[PDB]
Amino acid sequence: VKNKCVNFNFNGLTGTGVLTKSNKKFLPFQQFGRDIVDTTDAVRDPQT
Amino acid sequence: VLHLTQDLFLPFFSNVTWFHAIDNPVLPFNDGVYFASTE
Ligand SMILES: *[C@@H]1O[C@H](CO)[C@@H](O)[C@H](O)[C@H]1NC(C)=O
Ligand SMILES: *[C@@H]1O[C@H](CO)[C@@H](O)[C@H](O)[C@H]1NC(C)=O
Numbered sequence: 001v002k003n004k005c006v007n008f009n010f011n012g013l014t015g016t017g018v019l020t021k022s023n024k025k026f027l028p029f030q031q032f033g034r035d036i037v038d039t040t041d042a043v044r045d046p047q048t
Numbered sequence: 049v050l051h052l053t054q055d056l057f058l059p060f061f062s063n064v065t066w067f068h069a070i071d072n073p074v075l076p077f078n079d080g081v082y083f084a085s086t087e
Contacts, residue, residue: 036050
């Protein structure tokens with residue numbers, strides 16, 4: 001479910017937020033995302 | 049971002065030995081080794 005605040009458990013990375021499509025350029029080895037504040041910003045869906 | 053990491057890296061301007069081939073000596077392995085080859 002996108003554009004709706006929902007608790008997520010993506011591969012054991014529990015949390016809460018809003019999911020959406022991204023234009024980012026994740027490399028094949030990439031799984032996680034972050035920022036200079038070292039907090040998870042984007043995740044790659046294991047099943048899609 | 050300018051993420052700073054600490055890990056086993058090959059030093060910059062470090063000293064590397066160049067080998068030829070024409071017998072396959074065994075070289076020590078310690079904290080990782082770096083391998084390069086153009087063929
Ligand atoms: C997950 O499994 C289903 C059924 O086996 C399959 O249709 C789907 O493509 C799989 N997803 C990935 C990312 O491989
Ligand atoms: C690599 O070896 C040469 C000759 O043995 C030496 O002069 C040089 O200082 C070495 N490299 C470094 C980075 O010390």
